[PDB]
């Protein structure tokens, strides 16, 4: 039962008089728990899970203060990167950041992350060793050298191994009723004749948490991938997730085709047929 905390932010410039739109969200595993939207009236970090509302005004005052500073730094960085790339003021550009940490079931640090993108492409990221950087191009190596001179990796590593882990532990305890649950998928099969020779089988997984799941088809005992379709795992809207997998088969030969469902909430994988 390893766990993760991730923070995401997106800053989008708005050419003309306007300031950028900054949106930040935080997640514990697959459960969002905070948001900030610079366009919103509150100008505060806001709760998005019940188990974070118990934090006191001191928690919210600091989160609000720091997320506003983050938005202002990204506003400045949009100008810096525009300069590196010799880009005009006329276009909208986007800076994205993801960061956070993983812990094991004993609540101890496993892995840390900090990745940056510009206009939807890699820009610079912290390496797995939390001591070195990967820059995508020469602009990003200007940034890299600034961060090397500032010893940023050490300072960021202290956050990822320290603060990030300890607060993830706190959230996991305060939300244990829901975050340390596994909801197994409920599975069923549907069947749609196409023609005198073909039929569609669709294998459903509903109501599961966390989102990680594997659906696979087997024909007479070996994995079947030709003539299959797998949709992206999608939110149900109530905290659980959904997925389906389909295969086109000769009509009347559906008994050959077994759907296999793997999920951490299942003692053993489920198999099902029409």
């Amino acid at each position: 039962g390893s766990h993760s905390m991730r923070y995401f932010s997106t800053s989008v410039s708005r050419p003309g008089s306007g300031e950028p739109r900054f949106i930040a969200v935080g997640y514990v595993d697959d459960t969002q728990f905070v948001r900030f939207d610079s366009d919103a009236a509150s100008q505060r970090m806001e709760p998005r899970a019940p188990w974070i509302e118990q934090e006191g005004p001191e928690y919210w005052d600091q989160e609000t203060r720091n997320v506003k500073a983050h938005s202002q730094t990204d506003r400045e960085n949009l100008g810096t990167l525009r300069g590196y790339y010799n880009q005009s003021e006329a276009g909208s550009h986007t800076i994205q950041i993801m960061y956070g940490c993983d812990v094991g079931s004993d609540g101890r640090f496993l892995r840390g992350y900090e990745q940056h993108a510009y206009d939807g492409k890699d820009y610079i990221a912290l390496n797995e060793d939390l001591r070195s950087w990967t820059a995508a191009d020469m602009a990003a190596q200007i940034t890299q050298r600034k961060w090397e001179a500032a010893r940023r990796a050490e300072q960021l590593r202290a956050y990822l191994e320290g603060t990030c882990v300890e607060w993830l532990r706190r959230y996991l305890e305060n939300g244990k009723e829901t975050l340390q649950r596994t909801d197994p998928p409920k599975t069923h099969m549907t069947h749609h004749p196409i023609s005198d020779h073909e039929a569609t089988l669709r294998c459903w997984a509903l109501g599961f948490y966390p989102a990680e799941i594997t659906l696979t088809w087997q024909r007479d005992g070996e994995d079947q991938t030709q003539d299959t379709e797998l949709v992206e795992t999608r939110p149900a809207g109530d905290g659980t997730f959904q997925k389906w997998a389909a295969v086109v088969v000769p009509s009347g030969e559906e008994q050959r085709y077994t759907c296999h469902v793997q999920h951490e909430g299942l003692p053993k994988p489920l198999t099902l047929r029409w």
């Binding site: 923070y7 950041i97 603060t163």
Partner: peptide, 9 residues
């Protein structure tokens, strides 16, 4: 809890 500051690029 979020990090204290974002870095200048």
């Amino acid at each position: 809890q979020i990090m204290y500051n974002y870095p200048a690029m």
